[model samples]
Target: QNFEIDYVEMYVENLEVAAFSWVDKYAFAVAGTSRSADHRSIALRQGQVTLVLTEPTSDRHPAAAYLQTHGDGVADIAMATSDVAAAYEAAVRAGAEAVRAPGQHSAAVTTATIGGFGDVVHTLIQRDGTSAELPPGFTGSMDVTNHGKGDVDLLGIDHFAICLNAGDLGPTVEYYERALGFRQIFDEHIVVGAQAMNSTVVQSASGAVTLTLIEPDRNADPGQIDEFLKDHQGAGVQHIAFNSNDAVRAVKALSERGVEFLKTPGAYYDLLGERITLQTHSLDDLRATNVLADEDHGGQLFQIFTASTHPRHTIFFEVIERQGAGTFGSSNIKALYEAVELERTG
Candidate 1:
């Protein structure tokens, strides 16, 4: 309940390329940068989401080893908490493997780390007062001037969609629920064509962190979720969904800036009006931008997915605009399966 997402840190092979791609296409501004004696990291900001792209300079560093094994992927999900020591103690008591004990970073900040799914970690942070432009370890000597020109109207990180190995889904869900004080919000089994998948959504007690954990149906043929685990070599984050104010405008803007989105077939749009009675975005605009829509008791949601820019074709991005919508689009989840099936077969 006391946990809040502070930032998502990614370990990449080429920091410049990764930084430029997000800044140029996704409207992420370069808020700050830090360079230490061993490593360098760049902070990209869009609304409330802070993405820290890091690359290791030394051969003995952990980031370098992670890049060698897993390539460019998320390394840490840093969470902000009011009490670092209590968080660390609780996590350890709840069977979470402690990575780093609580340590002071600066005069006003303290941090601790715990192992999460795969090689990913949760860095718990406690901030007492305003200190430096960047975190404690990195030196903020460089100036941040190059802000992106585009406007995507991004709000913040909505949720993380993670794929686990075939038999690891249930245990992982229990780990989060029992260890991290998260609750199971939604659970579903989806089948499309010959492929099938099961998803269980978990959220923090404060609703600040949401994770959708998915696993390929062992009885069905190997699908996109299986493909992700195979290509990634283990359990890992599949895609990050960015919360946006207007997917219609954001998708159009991103498309113009050379960002490629997954193709949503025309047939899906033909019967869209019959699916959801309440719609916030115009059908014409939704079709034009290839955005998908769904509705719940709370409100409507508009969403679209981008083709994986990663060379392995495992990691992608999704932009979603939820107008008071509380549920993840169950219909859109089926659409995602169909879209990915087409992509794989084609």
Candidate 2:
């Protein structure tokens, strides 16, 4: 039942550039780093999430293959568990491709890796103590407080928004259910203009991990989801939603740090009061920051997607603040689709 997302590992062409963005703009500290003969990698941390960025220096490195294929994107979503042996075997027995058998990484840690969808994999990590200790092969020599410690009010990774190939949505969702023991909480068919897509939200048993699996509708014209798979060269993570306690202040601070977020249409906010009651920020604040707000039965949520900084325009980031909301904002996604379409069309 372990579903705590420990970290997200990225394979990129230039680790410095990618790590710099996280350290400078995203308010993440350089937790650790390793420069092996095969690859150069750096780890960045904020709140409960740690992101590892690796750039292959040799063609023999596995990251080199990933970098060549998917460009700079997430390569692994590590799941922190109480027992890696149980989680690893349970997943492998449930049809998960075994990438690595369970083994001890350190005095208080054991880890194992398994394939997740295409190139992205899931690393099951079990830590008894010293959870702040860096991963194997990485060393931390600098002070953590030297970097952005609590500059932005980030909590953890809210969820992962992944794009899948057509017809793989159900199977992928099933894989999460059977292999990792995740549950399907909600599903939706979103249509924008002539284009459409099917999305399913699955959460881990612990409710700590969530993935938004989306696939393009074949019957409709090609849209963002289609473009993502095509440009990315395979099904992979499209964007990661970073949990923020105050999206208004978080987004404003991020913009001040030179983070470029996607712009929404001015008319989209004119009828905001009719759509959902703001429990946190006002319409003026939302309008100024271009953040989207929606309410569910439990509470309200505010989220904003960043402009794709990826070279392939396939990967991005999202800052989300949940005010007792149990699920994601349904209307905000549609608005994002519309806003994205407008950006491209304009």
Candidate 3:
């Protein structure tokens, strides 16, 4: 079965602030909206990425509980499937926790939900030969005549970074492989100073959905991973990496908009020329914008991260540009960890 990421659902207490940040900084168009007596939602779209922001109007609403437990965070990573029933059945038969059974959403769509890591869930979506942009419940497009066009360099999601408890990495890997038929593409142990962590990258069969699962090393000094788990209250999404065709342009635009990116040490860029064979972006441009670069025999990769705007300083966003590289920029992992560590300490 083929699977592709369809959309991501974020549960936030303050919907207006979250929606505004995405539109102003990321250039996401307000595509659609829906409202009821007790809850409201706004849909934003940019290139291949779709994000639905929901807020609970009442204490009894489900989103209220999520916000209380995890603050503002991702609740669902929905994927598009060709066959909803077959996909749902396979996941259930493979010991996946069933959140919902397959059901028709409208005349043109069907959907189901499966339990994923922590409080996150996977939504399986199937389209029935129609051009509906969203599902059944949500109605109409949002008015965006006043909001000017923001940065247009960001294209789509490259991968999602998820933080797990110190010992949940192996079982989580097994769950994805057996439950969703995903394959582990890369694994690494990253250490910086007294801090250390392990990461495993998993991708769907169609290579449309990529997840980088991370866990702290129990024997090492407490680091950002541990801080995230403690501040977030449990395992949860740490950040979402958005793909960019030109990261130099993208990071520059975002910086102009007052977005704070993780600061890379000047020394790291001094020896960059000696590290990679092919350099796609100029070293001066990279240093000016504080963007990171990595390379393999295939090609080069460029990336930069935004400092967390959330109150807990846990969830953040990343912008990455991959020329032809398939790996997850492993060479830059330590630099990123050190950058975050510097931020946390300062």
Candidate 4:
């Protein structure tokens, strides 16, 4: 399936409590809200992205066990596909564990679920030839104009940084390649003191969907990667990286709004000038904003990460600006890992 991210479904304990932070700190406005006997769902939208948060209202809800086991975390990475039935059939034939067969979940929209790494799953979405503004059951219309005003125009979901168990990396990467037509794009190894991690990136042929898969290096001492598996209960999204047009302004606006970001070591910027020619941002701009930059043959990239305020520190967020680059910023990734490492133990 040549797919793009439709939305990420997160299982939370309270709908308004979780929704408020995203709306207040991240600048995402409420797109819609709906409820059933046992569960409530709220859709938050900003730029070109939408986050659906679900709260179990009763013990009978589907997300109740997930929240109990994993706390507030992503349950599904819903991907947009052209043909739900075809893709579902292909994935099943290719050894995917079928969670649900193709069916109309909403008017003019169809979806099928497939098991993903650990507890995470994929909900393949097909909008059946209609330009629906919201998902089925969401009565409110999309706030299209509200999305264009963020200090940095959030283009859309850039990619997902997914953490897996130490041995699950190879099999999970292969699963995407075999079941969803995602191909390996990049691989990296990083060490922050005694802690180390192996990151292997993959994406669909269309390039609309990308996943930066990481697993702990068992040979190295336990670090954030290992901690995530323990607190998160298995494989799950570590961060959802969003693209922006101007990172300098973006960080400024978000910081002014009381959003907390991971701090970058000054030495990283002191040595950055010799790395590559700074493109969209001056070294001073990056240093001042604590943003990390790197470039590949395709182009330059600017990235920054938010601090995980979650008690378990399982998931966080990322904002990046890509100047024609297709690969992950290797140096930035390492720096981010180190920053996260320091904060984790600090």
TM-score of each: 0.94, 0.95, 0.95, 0.95
The sequence of per-residue lDDT tens digits that candidate 4 reaches over residues 34-141 is: 788888998888766888999998999769999888899989888888899999999999989999999986564788999988788898888543453565567676
Task: Flag regions of model 4 displaced more than 4 Å.
Answer: 106-108, 128-132, 144-152
On a 0 to 100 scale, what is the lDDT of residue 18 in model 3?
Answer: 88
Model 4, residue 261: displacement in angstroms?
A: 0.8
Predicted candidate 2 versus true structure: per-residue lDDT over 222-331, tens digit per residue: 99998899899999999899998889898888888888988987788987888777778889999999999987778988889888877787898999988888897669
Question: What's the C-alpha lDDT at position 66 in model 3?
Answer: 90
Encode model 3's per-residue lDDT on 292-333: one tens digit a residue. Answer: 888755688887778999999989999888998887666788
On a 0 to 1 TM-score scale, where does candidate 3 land against the true structure? 0.95
- The models' CA-based lDDT, in order, is 0.82, 0.85, 0.85, 0.85
Worst 10 residues of 3 by lDDT: 142-151
TM-score, cand. 4: 0.95
- In model 4, the Cα lDDT at residue 238 comes to 93
For candidate 4, the per-residue lDDT at 66 reads 94
Judged by whole-model lDDT over C-alpha atoms, candidate 4 comes out at 0.85
Model 1's number of clashes is 0
